[PDB]
Each structure stands twice: as C-alpha cells, then as structure tokens.
Design a protein around this ligand. Sequence first.
Ligand SMILES: [Cl-]
Length: 91
Amino acid sequence: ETESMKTVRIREKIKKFLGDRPRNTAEILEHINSTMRHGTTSQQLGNVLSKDKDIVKVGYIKRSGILSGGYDICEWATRNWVAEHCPEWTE
Ligand SMILES: [Cl-]
C-alpha cells in the first residue's frame, strides 16, 4: 500500500523485463503500466530507474528541432546484464 512498497514492486518488474536485453524508457513504461492497476508516469519512472543502482543507463538520444520540439529517449539495462555482455565496462 505504501509508496515504497509500490516502488519495490515496480523495481522487481523492471529488472525481470530488462533480463533479456536493454530497453528504452518508453518500452519499460508500457510494460510496467500494462501489468499494474495504476502504474506510473514517464517522469516518475525516470526517477525510479536512476535511483535503482541495479538498473544502469547504457544509452541516450536527445532530439531537438524547430518542428520536433525536444525529447529524450534513454536506454537501460541491468547491471548484471552489462557485466556479462560488456565485461570491460565500469562505472
Ligand atoms: Cl499500481
């Protein structure tokens, strides 16, 4: 019922989802929100992903344009996935 309990539940779902390969924030949000009653927002999810040390940011695209407006897309992986697939990587 608590916000922490929800956040813990969300973290476990995200980690399972990211098991196979890295995914972008939009894909993660769609997955999470497809399997929870209320789910979360892209802003809140970004915070959760950043705060969870088991889930690491592996890429980014930022777009800006006089027509595009601006947006970012971030790519995330589990730390263990990175350790296994990029064994020269460190942070
Ligand atoms: Cl929920």
